[PDB]
Ligand binder design. Structure first.
Ligand code: S4I
Length: 134
């Protein structure tokens, strides 16, 4: 049903801003921040029926999530948090909320021009990560 069509594909990270500070706010430790911050992941997004799959492949970690919009799931993040996640579409933006230990962070993924822009927010700290088609 052409849900998420403009997101589907293989995307490569081309810029990052404020990611170390976002990771600090989330609680990521020093060594993981350094290695994770170096990574240039590819994000691979696909849809099969109602199921969306987002894979992230990098030299740091490979991650994979599959989900149905609005339906909570378990996620182990790249930094090894065990979180409860819900992903919805809000006005054409994929909004990914992660909950763990009474904390919450939100990752928004949006298409803007030929890029896919990822905004990661923890309390007052935002990181913006820009991906281009691979
Ligand atoms: O899901 C994404 C995505 O498509 C990014 O660019 C950043 N991110 C969150 C994130 C948090 C912590 C670590 Cl260690 C690694 C990634």
């Amino acid at each position: 049903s052409h849900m998420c069509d403009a997101f589907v594909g293989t995307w490569k990270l081309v810029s990052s801003e404020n990611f170390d500070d976002y990771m600090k706010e989330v609680g990521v430790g020093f060594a993981t921040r350094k290695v994770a911050g170096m990574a240039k992941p590819n994000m691979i997004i696909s849809v099969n029926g109602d199921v969306i799959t987002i894979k992230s492949e990098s030299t740091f970690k490979n991650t994979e999530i599959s989900f149905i919009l609005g339906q909570e799931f378990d996620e182990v993040t790249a930094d090894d948090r065990k979180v409860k996640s819900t992903i919805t579409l809000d006005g054409g933006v994929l909004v990914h909320v992660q909950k763990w230990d009474g904390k919450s962070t939100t990752i928004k993924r949006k298409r803007e021009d030929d890029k896919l822009v990822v905004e990661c927010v923890m309390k007052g700290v935002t990181s913006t990560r820009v991906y281009e088609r691979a």
